[PDB]
Structures are given as C-alpha cells and as structure tokens.
Amino acid sequence: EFRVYSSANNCTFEYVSQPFLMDFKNLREFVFKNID
C-alpha cells in the first residue's frame, strides 16, 4: 500500500535486505545518526 507519498522523481539510493521490524511485550530501540 503506497499511501505515503503521491509523486515520484529521480531516486538516488535503493536498498533491500532483511527487515528492520522483527518478532505490548517487546521493546525495539532505534538510534538514527546522520554525520558526515
């Protein structure tokens, strides 16, 4: 379901791998870091 965006354009990076989501009885901590 592509209900997030409407219009598309020139993509720069694509990545497919094992999913980040895996397995209220589970904690999932995430830290995002954009340096250099």
Binding site: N10, T12, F13, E14
Partner: protein, 48 residues
C-alpha cells in the same frame, strides 16, 4: 553493452548506474574495438 534493442540518438536513455564494483575488463569479447580514445582519466587508471 550486450543488450538486444538500442535507443535512437534523439531518444537516448540515461540509466543511473551506481552502488557496485565497476569492472571494466568485460569489454574485450566484442568486435575489434575501433574506438577507445578517452577524454578524461586514463584507461589504466579506471580500476582504482
């Protein structure tokens, strides 16, 4: 290089090629290679 149908020179495509290793050593199995005069980095300095 080894495709089937090519595009015309007024409708020339532009495919963005990225996120790999770039092996330029697969350019030797074709017809005897009439044009490789480069205008930038030398052909011996393409693999580094």
């Amino acid at each position: 290089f080894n495709a089937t149908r090519f595009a015309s020179v007024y409708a020339w495509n532009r495919k963005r090629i990225s996120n790999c290793v770039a092996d330029y050593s697969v350019l030797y199995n074709l017809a005897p290679f009439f044009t490789f005069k480069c205008y930038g980095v030398s052909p011996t300095k393409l693999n580094d």
